[PDB]
Amino acid sequence: RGSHMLDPSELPSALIGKPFPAFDLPSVQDPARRLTEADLKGKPALVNVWGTWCPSCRVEHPELTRLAEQGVVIYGINYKDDNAAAIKWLNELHNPYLLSISDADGTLGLDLGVYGAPETYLIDKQGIIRHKIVGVVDQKVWREQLAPLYQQLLD
């Protein structure tokens, strides 16, 4: 395999200081209920990109719950997934997400620079992106890579 370069939008630094991309998408649990980027505003928060196709996302789930238990607001982007399967996941396991955005065609992921899962965006209360983690967030990642910035956004 020859070299393959990710495009600039997929770099963790790409959307730093930029507003969360605009979108109008159905919620996972109710397709008649519509969500937009305005629903992400108000509190500093994580935006976690996940899919039922994603074994790493299954593994990350207990950590996301652990953060939610400590009052961390987490919104979920269900990316290019089976909706029925996604609803099951949100039922069978312990939903840490305050909102579950159905991004079935990946157009929101497209604007975010998403190229798999899990990926986690830290946003401020204005919905401006402040950090991006590619791959599983564990205690260590949270403690070192997110926690310090998240604390600043609360203050």
Curated annotation (Swiss-Prot):
Coiled-coil residue windows: none
**Keyword Disulfide bond applies:** yes
Query: What GO cellular-component annotations does this UniProt entry give?
Result: outer membrane-bounded periplasmic space; plasma membrane
Give the record's keywords alphabetically. Cell inner membrane, Cell membrane, Cytochrome c-type biogenesis, Disulfide bond, Membrane, Redox-active center, Transmembrane, Transmembrane helix
Entry keyword Transferase: no
The cysteines joined by S-S bonds are C54-C57
Thioredoxin domain sequence ranges = 14-155
Q: How does it sit in the membrane?
A: Single-pass membrane protein
- Tell me, which GO biological process terms does this entry list? cytochrome complex assembly
Q: Which GO terms label this protein's molecular function in UniProt?
A: disulfide oxidoreductase activity
Please list the residue ranges that the record places on the Periplasmic side of the membrane: 6-155
**Where does the record say this protein resides?**
Cell inner membrane
Please give the superkingdom of this protein's source: Bacteria
Taking the first listed entry, what is the main subcellular location of this protein, grouped into a coarse class? membrane
For this chain, the family text in UniProt reads:
Belongs to the thioredoxin family. DsbE subfamily.
General function of this protein: Involved in disulfide bond formation. Catalyzes a late, reductive step in the assembly of periplasmic c-type cytochromes, probably the reduction of disulfide bonds of the apocytochrome c to allow covalent linkage with the heme. Possible subunit of a heme lyase.
Query: What is the designated name of this protein?
Result: Thiol:disulfide interchange protein DsbE
Species:
Pseudomonas aeruginosa (strain ATCC 15692 / DSM 22644 / CIP 104116 / JCM 14847 / LMG 12228 / 1C / PRS 101 / PAO1)
Say which residues of the entire protein are included here.
26 to 175 of 180
